[PDB]
Amino acid sequence: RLLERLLPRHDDFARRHIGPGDKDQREMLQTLGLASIDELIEKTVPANIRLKRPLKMEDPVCENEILATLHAISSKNQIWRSYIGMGYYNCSVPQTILRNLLENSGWITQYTPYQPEVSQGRLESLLNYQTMVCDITGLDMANASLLDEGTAAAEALQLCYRHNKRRKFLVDPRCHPQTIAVVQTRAKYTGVLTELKLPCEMDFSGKDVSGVLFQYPDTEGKVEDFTELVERAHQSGSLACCATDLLALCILRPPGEFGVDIALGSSQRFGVPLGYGGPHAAFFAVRESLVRMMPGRMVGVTRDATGKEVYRLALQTREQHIRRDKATSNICTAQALLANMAAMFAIYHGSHGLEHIARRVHNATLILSEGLKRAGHQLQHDLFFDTLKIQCGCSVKEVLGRAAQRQINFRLFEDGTLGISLDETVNEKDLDDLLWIFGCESSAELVAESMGEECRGIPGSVFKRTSPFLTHQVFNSYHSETNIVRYMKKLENKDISLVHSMIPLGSCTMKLNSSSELAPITWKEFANIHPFVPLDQAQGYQQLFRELEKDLCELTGYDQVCFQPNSGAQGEYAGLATIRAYLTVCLIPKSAHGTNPASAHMAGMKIQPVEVDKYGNIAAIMITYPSTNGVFEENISDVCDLIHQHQVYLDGANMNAQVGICRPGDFGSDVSHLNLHKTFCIPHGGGGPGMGPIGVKKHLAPFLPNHPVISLKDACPVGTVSAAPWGSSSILPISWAYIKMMGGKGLKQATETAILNANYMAKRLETHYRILFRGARGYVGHEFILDTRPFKKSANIEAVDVAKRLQDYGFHAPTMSWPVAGTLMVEPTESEDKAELDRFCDAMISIRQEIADIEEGRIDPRVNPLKMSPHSLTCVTSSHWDRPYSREVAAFPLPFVKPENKFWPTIARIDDIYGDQHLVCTCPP
Amino acid sequence: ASRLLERLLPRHDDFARRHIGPGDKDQREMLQTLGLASIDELIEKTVPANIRLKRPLKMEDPVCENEILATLHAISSKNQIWRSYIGMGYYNCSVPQTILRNLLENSGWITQYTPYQPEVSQGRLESLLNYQTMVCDITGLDMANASLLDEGTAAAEALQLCYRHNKRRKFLVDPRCHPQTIAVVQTRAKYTGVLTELKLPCEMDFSGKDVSGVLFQYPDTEGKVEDFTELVERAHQSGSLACCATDLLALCILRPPGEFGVDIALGSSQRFGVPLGYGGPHAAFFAVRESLVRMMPGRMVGVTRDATGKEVYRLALQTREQHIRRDKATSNICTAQALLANMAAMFAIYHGSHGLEHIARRVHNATLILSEGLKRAGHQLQHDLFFDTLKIQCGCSVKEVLGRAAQRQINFRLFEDGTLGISLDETVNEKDLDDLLWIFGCESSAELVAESMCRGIPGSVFKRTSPFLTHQVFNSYHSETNIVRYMKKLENKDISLVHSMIPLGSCTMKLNSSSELAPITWKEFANIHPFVPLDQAQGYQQLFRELEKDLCELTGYDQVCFQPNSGAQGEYAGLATIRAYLNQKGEGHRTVCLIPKSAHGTNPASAHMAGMKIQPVEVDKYGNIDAVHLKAMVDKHKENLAAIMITYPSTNGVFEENISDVCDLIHQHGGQVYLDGANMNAQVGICRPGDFGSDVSHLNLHKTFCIPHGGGGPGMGPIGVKKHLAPFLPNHPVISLKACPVGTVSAAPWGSSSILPISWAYIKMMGGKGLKQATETAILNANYMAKRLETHYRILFRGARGYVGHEFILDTRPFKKSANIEAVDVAKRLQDYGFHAPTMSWPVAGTLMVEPTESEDKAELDRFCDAMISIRQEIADIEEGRIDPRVNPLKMSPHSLTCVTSSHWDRPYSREVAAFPLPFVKPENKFWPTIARIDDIYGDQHLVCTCPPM
């Protein structure tokens, strides 16, 4: 149009997202000996599996309009005061943690702390989170987060099965309903029988029961003594698992002190938004003797090469990347970032501030309780923390009518009674609205005057907490705003992130997490809605779900998406369970991510491994296209046809090599998870949050996950896989914004440049290191493997030496020893420009020459920069220097590493064995 | 006495507990160190009894931090965000979100102040050098400063520069300059003694050789692009200078002032990625020819060497500024708009010349399109050639147009003569063009108008053909990934409040809280045009009233004027109001202003700018105003006495015993009392300047009331006045503030309105109790530090009973004789201990002045005292011969990373002593000075004030 020539688009976000401009791409193409981008794709991606017609999507939205566009959606939501409860409680998110951690690119762009020596910040903070959970729950050791409350409870069930092998598990029906549904789904496919029984109905006599799950306080609000239940279970060989609340436990005697084996719940009310379901770090802590069976990551204390006390992920042999189908769970990405928010919450308040918040909430509930009783309403339970169950003396409708006038939501119980869960945000004004809602012609002031100040409730009961918590210096040091900012910065600056340098982690897609994408996750219209609100309050979210679904259906070739799964691994489990509901043998290549076999074990499938040939190539199969080695298989249609002849799950984690070029649904796949936090810009967050939505073909849609609280429907659902119906809803705007900004053209170009960048790097490094696997005509997809294994024989150099030595050149290492042990796998993504790629290649080329010096007797084979790496500031600034290379070689190996940009590894090399032999997983004194 | 509810259900939080560092335990220990039982005893012994409050501050109940944003939202949502195409120097722009998030809302960019200590400030120094380079390239002039306050104040500075250059008393102003620009220039001329004349180029008479300079605008306020070559040449042939107000976006496609002979180019940098802000803050630009640079106002970054010979940055030719030359300085300006200059530089780095040309072409073509649509519809365009601004005579009724405009919530500029101004901007899309065309009754769409259309600037002789932004810095960081990395690189070179206490005397480096900062980027504050109709800014009005009333109550004044956009502007404004009052009263012969020699350099400069005869008053050996010399000087000038400028407490941190007497004395002899409020952090909740005889004070919101220091701006300097001065307070020619106004001192009626919420939020969160406690702890902390250092260094001045206020001076001068150690040695050596130095060599040369503020806790204060105590022992080593006097830690400081990690080490102390002097300085928190010691003389001898190659 002539308008478009006179008045072009204001901006094109693809130009900001994609690093290499025109000049870079031409030069990279010259380096590959190719005339154009299309030629590269034609020589990489098999012709017969490419798209017929280009992605059909909306015209791209300029970056300078994306927030107004999205506001037109989010403003459709209504922000009521929700006192629904059910595991989500509004809280006061300290603005300084929101600003300096959540909206800080130096906290949120890094991923899992695999490389500890450039990750001590987030490792300390996750150690703070564990310490907090252990102190408050009263149990011995806690993990570095699970996905949500209900999954954490399923993991408790699974832990119990792993401990004693018994096929029965008793559930208290007073657990939250979404918790029950997720535990029953896991039990169903793991082969364990669950029974809904109250403590008095629970029969342990038969010595068949693995464990019991109850809640404290329970879903109705009641505080109950489980000492006797726990003792009865113990005398019959069963374990006792307790879902709980960290705020409640600030004044309640905790599960640890009435014999509980496993304590779990959500950390959400410790300073994290409602988020319309997530993301929230769940907690999960166990007795000392159960720790070998712990799920997820767990920070421990160890030594470095100098003997300094330092942090690192401990007992890693439990996890998916080592033990695969024999692992303690399929979980990979958890909710590291939001665990760190909650730990900062507890550091900022201290035990003293958490007691103040908890007492205040409880007294506000006690006050409301007396007001309602005065007015002729009936309270079902005398002792509670923050939650009342009310039989209305007057009409329930007229109450709800008034409640609607003050825009307040209650929990509507099946039996016609009401749930009210007060929280940290509740003040006098709200109590007055609440008392007016129930027709009590008395204010909160006046009700309080005739209560007196004899202690009542929890402080006046035998359930009074007497044990201390958060006595470590870290929880009693950073209470001024000035101090917490300084502390958050100190830990930030220890962690190498995307504000520093490329993090080319294979199968992680460390691409740009844009500001404009990130902004909306802290908008009140997304962050401050309770997941279980009536749907007329969440019509903005509905529209977001539809638009993102439709877009994702179009990129993948599937028919319907389910947002419920809140990690890739959860999507695999969900996808496999949907295949089983539609219908047990699951074929899995040995090249598959460790989540693949673990998910299948969790979904109750018999795993048959399939071998990989020497060129790297190969109820259901799990495939990945491209290969977890970055190579496109020539005849993937044939594999899909073959399985269908006798369903096909396709792992989507490598979709950044596909988008706008080919689609898994077009070539025979029935179901895929997508990693939104890897391909679609959700921030990696130090190891979470992520989302793992599954696209399915028409025929699987009737069996997709449902939810017992908010209904997601010929339906025949597999069950329920996450605590919240659409998982971590509040981070979904990030991927919607990427997609709507990029458009069809931009998304295609991003995939193009991801492949270009990976091949350019491989090309540059091919005469220095072996590129282990390639496609039929020699080209890789979006990543490649450098075979460092030969340097073991020639120089006694291991991949780990190269990993640590890279830190000295200003780079986080690529992915290590997977899919192939003793190798590096490299994924630059599209967001990094030529000069950044050239620095990484030059660092590797220079390291190659260091290996050559050892291979040639030019430098001591025991004491060289590779074996002594990383080189800390304390090492390099010491007066003591007794090494046969200079300090310049150690810390500034090439001229692009300058004092002006020098990132310091904060410690010497990590000792892996020592920490697991001296297991300490709480902040030491 | 409390309600039962308040005991069962106390306040959710108290922000004073987060703002004030020392808790109960700290304060008890500090009190023990002072030998005092309680806080009240301290105050009783510090602040004289007779000037203290008779009753507590009467203020609203404090607002919990967890409700402050909801409370403020109830005010801000009263504003209406229309699409404003008013123009008049403010043009909506698309603020790149990544710069907003990673710079504006980064505490690592905004908490630091003026880059006095260059070796821990190279980041923001490079960025200000980027800003200068950008201005110089785009304007085509030789050297630019590191920001002025706004467009109109920059134009007044041009007038003043011209007077300084040639001493002629006439200055010609084009009436097609923006009206607020004219009003601010006329106000400055009025009190400086220069006569302005409003004359069009053809009416301008340069032939008498009595014209200092001329000011015109390009494009002018009506939108027109005109050739000023001949005007400039005529002025030059008669000895006058030519000053040009301009627009940086416009100049991306227009040949700039540099290429038609202009001597001074200025304007606002606001379009380059900074919000409308309902007036501010925006960095103004100001650039000059090579030969005029000695007379430059403000700061200016220059290139120099460090001790190793490395190329590095620092503030250049500092002898021009207020802190050195005082009343002989090139201006009174101190705090400028450093942070917003850095935003605009990042804007230009992110877009490059190529992206700025794209934005500018797009805006211009959007205007050309609108232009053809209006002509088709029967409306008359007054000027053929424009950038983004049309002047329209409506073919139909103006009312029916404005009626329709109101229906699409669009504002135009209403000219006095019944015509309309429309200024398009970067935010204007097809949809808006269509609304605009519908507004004027053109039934054609933008698409259709465009189909029947190079013309405009590209088709004219005004086409820009000169390049700009050819340096690598403007062609390197176009990916979002790169610009984030670049902003971080510069952030991490700058020590800030995310690292350690910055105890800068006379700066009040207190907490800039997140919850206070959050609202400044709310659309309801950030995206309103300063000249909108007032029914669109009723939230702002309510904010102004509430903050005014609160500030009136803390100060004892009757009315506040928010127009002045720095403390120094408030001084100038306050002094000018005193002169207008005196003129009204029959007493304009009174021009003498008495100023103690201890006064901030802004004091004498402001008085010179306001046209007062300065008489210095001496200070005695005890640090007080010399009562004999004062009495003499009062008597000498009693018939001509206009004012005194005092500071309570003194600029040395001491409370004067008889300040009432000083005020009474001046009032006895026919003059008014101006009180410099910059030290109000020692007063709030305890005493009030209005109660003891003061008539007028500026307050520094960016010092006492939590506005972020921003690397040297932004600030606000509101003046409180007594009833009798209120009729003479500044007004504004566009939005009426009323009366017999002094004139207009800032471009925007309430200055930088969008940062005012920060101080409102501090005040409403703290309450009467919290504000008092903050002042209490500021005084406690300062005395505790002085107490701990008194046997190692001389505390130069104290109050009558031995106690200081909120700051104190360490007399380091004796170490010159005993060890050949200068204050600067101590300043640089402190960097090695992880601290930015305190304020240096003012009020007393060769000394350090220390202000911890209330926001820092005991352990942080103890770290600073231990660093000083340890440095004392280093000085002792030189005094007693234990270490070389030339080569020791103090003389070699700061110690950079490159120095300490070198293989070559030839110093008589260890690397550990150099970089980790005490155990609290650890690898895990080590802040590195990024360069060796700065060479001060070399840079001023080899003046280079733009980014050098590569």
Ligand SMILES: *Cc1c(COP(=O)(O)O)cnc(C)c1O
């Ligand atoms: C990264 C990745 C996953 C991620 O699973 P999460 O639970 O989201 O961490 C799964 N599969 C493959 C092949 C991956 O590369």
Ligand SMILES: *Cc1c(COP(=O)(O)O)cnc(C)c1O
């Ligand atoms: C900071 C200051 C000023 C002027 O403030 P600006 O905002 O920089 O103009 C005046 N007097 C004293 C004592 C100051 O500290």
